[PDB]
Design a protein around this ligand. Sequence first.
Ligand SMILES: Nc1ncnc2c1ncn2[C@@H]1O[C@H](COP(=O)(O)OP(=O)(O)OP(O)(O)=S)[C@@H](O)[C@H]1O
Ligand SMILES: Nc1ncnc2c1ncn2[C@@H]1O[C@H](COP(=O)(O)OP(=O)(O)OP(O)(O)=S)[C@@H](O)[C@H]1O
Ligand SMILES: Nc1ncnc2c1ncn2[C@@H]1O[C@H](COP(=O)(O)OP(=O)(O)OP(O)(O)=S)[C@@H](O)[C@H]1O
Ligand SMILES: [Mg+2]
Ligand SMILES: [Mg+2]
Ligand SMILES: [Mg+2]
Lengths: 614, 319, 255, 163
Amino acid sequence: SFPEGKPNCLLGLTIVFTGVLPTLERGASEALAKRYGARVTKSISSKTSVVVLGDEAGPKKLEKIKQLKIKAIDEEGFKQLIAGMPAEGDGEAAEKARRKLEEQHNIATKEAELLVKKEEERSKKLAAVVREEDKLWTVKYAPTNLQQVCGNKGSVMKLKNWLANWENSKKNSFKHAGKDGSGVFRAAMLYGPPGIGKTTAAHLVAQELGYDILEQNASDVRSKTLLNAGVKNALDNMSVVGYFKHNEEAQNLNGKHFVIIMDEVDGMSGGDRGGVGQLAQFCRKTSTPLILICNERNLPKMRPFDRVCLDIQFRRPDANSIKSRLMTIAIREKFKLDPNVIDRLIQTTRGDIRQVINLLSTISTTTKTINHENINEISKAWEKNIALKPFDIAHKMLDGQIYSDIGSRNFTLNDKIALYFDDFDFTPLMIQENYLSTRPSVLKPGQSHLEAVAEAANCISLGDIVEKKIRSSEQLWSLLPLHAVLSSVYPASKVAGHMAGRINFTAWLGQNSKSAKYYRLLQEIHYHTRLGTSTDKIGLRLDYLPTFRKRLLDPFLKQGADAISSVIEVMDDYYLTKEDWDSIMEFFVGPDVTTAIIKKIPATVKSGFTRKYN
Amino acid sequence: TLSLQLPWVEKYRPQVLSDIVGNKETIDRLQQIAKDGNMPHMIISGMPGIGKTTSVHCLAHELLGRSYADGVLELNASDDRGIDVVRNQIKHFAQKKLHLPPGKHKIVILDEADSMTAGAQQALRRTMELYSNSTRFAFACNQSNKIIEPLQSRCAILRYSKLSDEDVLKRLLQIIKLEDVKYTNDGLEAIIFTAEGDMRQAINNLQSTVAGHGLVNADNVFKIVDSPHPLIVKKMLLASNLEDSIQILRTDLWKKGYSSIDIVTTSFRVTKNLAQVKESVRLEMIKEIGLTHMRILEGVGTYLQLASMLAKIHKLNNK
Amino acid sequence: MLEAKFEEASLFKRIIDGFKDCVQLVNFQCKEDGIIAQAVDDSRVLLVSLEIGVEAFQEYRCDHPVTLGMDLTSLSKILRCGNNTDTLTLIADNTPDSIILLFEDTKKDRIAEYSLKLMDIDADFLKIEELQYDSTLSLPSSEFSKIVRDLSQLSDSINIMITKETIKFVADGDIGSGSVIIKPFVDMEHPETSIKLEMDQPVDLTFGAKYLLDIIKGSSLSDRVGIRLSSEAPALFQFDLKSGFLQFFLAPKFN
Amino acid sequence: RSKENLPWVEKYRPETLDEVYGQNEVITTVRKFVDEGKLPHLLFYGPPGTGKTSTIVALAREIYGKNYSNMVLELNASDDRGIDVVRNQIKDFASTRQIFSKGFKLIILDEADAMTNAAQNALRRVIERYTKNTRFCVLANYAHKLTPALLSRCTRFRFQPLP
DNA sequence: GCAGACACTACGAGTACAAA
DNA sequence: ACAGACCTAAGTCCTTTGTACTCGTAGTGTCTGC
DNA sequence: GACTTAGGTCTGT
Ligand SMILES: Nc1ncnc2c1ncn2[C@@H]1O[C@H](COP(=O)(O)OP(=O)(O)OP(O)(O)=S)[C@@H](O)[C@H]1O
Ligand SMILES: Nc1ncnc2c1ncn2[C@@H]1O[C@H](COP(=O)(O)OP(=O)(O)OP(O)(O)=S)[C@@H](O)[C@H]1O
Ligand SMILES: Nc1ncnc2c1ncn2[C@@H]1O[C@H](COP(=O)(O)OP(=O)(O)OP(O)(O)=S)[C@@H](O)[C@H]1O
Ligand SMILES: [Mg+2]
Ligand SMILES: [Mg+2]
Ligand SMILES: [Mg+2]
């Protein structure tokens, strides 16, 4: 199919594969472009050298192309483009990329030579306990200082600054925030995807700043009693191992004090009895720095930590930062790695430097050259299967490409059921919320958007029936696959297409909580009025409350401050309270909404009313 | 009688890594780690009976030599694998001192690791890293999704695949030669077909056929092992005429004793796994079988409801 | 190798029971002088040092110096197995992977060999240097245990202020507060009940309660406690043995 | 009583393998298995009242004799389907020897289709580890409830509706 | 006889439920 | 140096039930010491 | 072909 080209032929060219290509999928086109050194970006821009679109382009991206005047080609044009251009990209943009590649290779070689020198020094010391070969590639190449961490440079700088002026903030009693603003908080959290060096960064910053590190695995120790004893006693005591560790030398005054680096804080037990909420009480009073670390910060059990900590989000490092590190480890370990593969490896692993390290360690045992020939199989065997966020499930579920004839073969129906089963508590709600905000692209001939929407709504009603049968006293969970199809897959297939606006979260939860609160309030008022009123709960709201308004709020609107007594009388005729009055006035809808009216009665009448009732 | 012979599944279990037939690349990599040493943390995932426990045990034995008694720790789903075992048993085993060959390390084999509690899995995260210099953890599980992502990050992910018919035929031929069993090519082919890549089921069915009837023939194998239920379900679903499908349901399924719940569930699975039928038609037939499944689970399980389900499916196919 | 024979096995059992609820893992370095071992607490707030000399053992032989990394709870379990009057012989082979405790009774022919697997502990041999102590006190062990246990109920802090010829312990808690004051008295008729004071400089120091009950748990080792107090330095709590001691280095609260 | 004051369903319960009719294939194959001693892990799946419990009880009677109620672990999986049973009763029974006479051990799990997924995931290795001394029998009306793993370690016999 | 001291059993809150 | 310009990594974001399982807290009974 | 928010890195003025 695609003709072969000279190595790094497409170097220095920014190519965006917007259009659908008959022969190659988007991933295949990206791979065949990155094999030759091309740069692929998701946004068409001024610096975009070439846009590849055979057909089926997007109107927004098309408008961007028209405004920016970017040259465009088709798939056959791309095939012609691959072969023609010379090796290594000539053009100045190609020369810049050549210089960058050479510089990265030189840095890798220099650091590999440095590692060889360190190994020789260690061998000389040993001649004069665990052998370095026995160590894993993850630990033998662990960063020894902040200057070797990959990505999140701002995050490590912020942590270093916070821990550095923590002493000054303590002198200021934490009331003053400072220039950076991190000094107000007494504890700091590092949260992000696994394996991006949160623990490494914390250990190294605490080492450089001279404090004595105390590490506690919060998953191992999560009970309230053990947590209390251990770290409550540790929060305000000195370090004996630190006092005896050469306090006589005056360089490090922080050597006595503690930095408690708590790992796997996401593994704490939940609830008031659980220790996840108790540790916030700890951070609310600390004489030593606290560095909590968690993977899933946006987790309900972790709500109490929100306001008592400095939240620091560690993000997945971009491939460019990690290329240099992988090049040093590859030059040292005598396995050939070409840079063009590196990016996809990171995309295979989703920004987990640890798993890329282990991937290279495992694969290099047999295959000594990781190149463009075997990268596809490596990705297909080592790809991370991570449960998508509900927003991503909604995006893929309401996607036209998924339910097309060609897309169905790539993503089978079983895969759509798996997408539902990733999160079985929210996808039915997300689809219900965002099945009517999409421009459809799978409308059958003779069907409008409204017909597909109505069919989808009928299917959601049937899925709600299935869910109730699933989630009731019968507990027919064997219908869970069926609830997969009726609630999520079928309506989305009916209204599949492009996303018109944004993907909103399920509004059902908030309005359901509001309805529960209003039902509770209505129960209180109804049981207060029961001794006089011969009604049920619903009848009161339907009939009496509209009449009760005319006898409660309207006299305040019309006759004036002398209505209080009369109002009080009818109040005392049904055992109403001031809270009862405020609740009744909050039940009306549409034309009779009282929120603006209660603002327009003068404050004198309100104060007199409360005073008279009291 | 008082004593029983070993099943050929356990008697002929591979004791060296070379005997394992399928998934050649992973097995060769495990042999290279076996020779060189320094085995990283690993998670072995796949389908039942493709040699996951056997692979890890061959690797552990070959690595640890005579030190398998002390350096290797079994933990199975049959044992208590809560957070307690991580705190008390796993941590103490990993802290233990033991002098080993220069490259090899102590090995923790956690079989059926998919059933480990979330608390135990989270607690294992730091025991994995702190004591990695001395101990290397190995997990074997059917589903890799059940193991938390932080644990998945620290280990090499090896995914095993279903065994091709050729490898099953080779292993069965070897067992045939060692045990001097009389066979026919049709019987062996039927055994592979019924096994569907599950080598454990292949060996078990072969041994059962030999014991019950004495000759591995197509007739004997099909007598002792039924033809797959999903195949007759698929044939019933994809029938051209309603009467033909009704005949299949009556004779092959209802009269042979298959329960209505089984037919409906297998119909749903065959429908969702079918490829020739277009996705829209598959979804609508899935809806009809879902209605029928609800009716069956509500206590109304009869031939009439299944027949109505097939009639609806044929109406859907007939436009 | 190593072959160290105790006179009596109850001594080792009590020694291990003394400091097993504060630290879980230890390193016993067996030198020609005896068995020296320090353990840093998990909280890194207390340090335990133990020395048992050759005079303690009936027959101690060591060929090459070794360290035995051990778990205190497992050793306590093993020591609970032996009888009170048995002679416990610790025997270790070259490249030790386990220590073979050997309980034996001369009256009968009963022999009990328990092999305790050796734990691999990697920790530094932190150097210990004495300093001039502002206050050195010698008190009865049972008395001190009682004040510590009584005051620990009210609060988690124990404030020892040694004013002129006075030692007062104070605890301030959410519900109630307590104060116990001791005067120094020396009794010729019973030396054990005597209270001994040396005060170069008066001291006031607050110490954590939990570590303090962990310290008082060693009361069985010796009749008298030795408390060395300096304002900016960790406090020493010593329970003296016939050929050694159980030194506890404790860190006070910030003040 | 004298087994005469019992319902005809119970009083006419088969007591020997020769009094079970209809499933001649299964009965003959199992009889040959037990005679040659190569009895695998059995899974009798079929409709109600087709004679699975009677078949396995008569098999235990034939293999062990009259005192089969003390030397076979018969567990009603409906009454106890927890993983605790797998850890405590099933595994201790499989591991130990026999208090009455020498021989292998049989565990008859009745209505195992009610067994919880955790219990079956625990039993899928209890079955494998102690295959030297014990064998497992699984009785089922519905095979969809049972885990796929437990359906690969047991030789399957289908009980046809009675002709 | 009388009081703690671990160790077993009872109670209570949190979480996941499928398919391959 | 500084805002802009590319490019990419990320966040929007909480409902019951029936029964089994687990884990930490609270309660109980029983053994040892004085 | 989803919105806003945000980080890291370059070049130009
Ligand atoms: N940014 C990085 N640069 C270099 N090496 C890294 C980086 N991130 C992770 N590593 C490697 O991965 C190892 C483990 O890093 P960790 O700090 O433990 O990751 P993590 O973010 O704590 O993930 P967890 O433990 O699942 S929350 C380190 O010792 C390094 O070898
Ligand atoms: N690749 C293979 N080569 C040879 N025998 C095999 C192979 N795969 C399975 N077997 C046979 O099947 C038996 C069971 O193997 P296991 O590895 O224990 O199964 P598994 O793959 O671990 O799946 P489980 O046990 O259900 S989690 C072995 O003892 C062999 O007899
Ligand atoms: N094949 C048979 N031969 C003779 N009597 C039989 C046969 N099958 C069933 N019966 C009679 O029916 C009764 C019930 O048999 P069971 O074996 O208990 O039924 P089952 O096969 O276990 O089905 P279940 O209990 O619903 S799973 C027996 O006690 C006999 O009286
Ligand atoms: Mg970490
Ligand atoms: Mg297995
Ligand atoms: Mg029965």
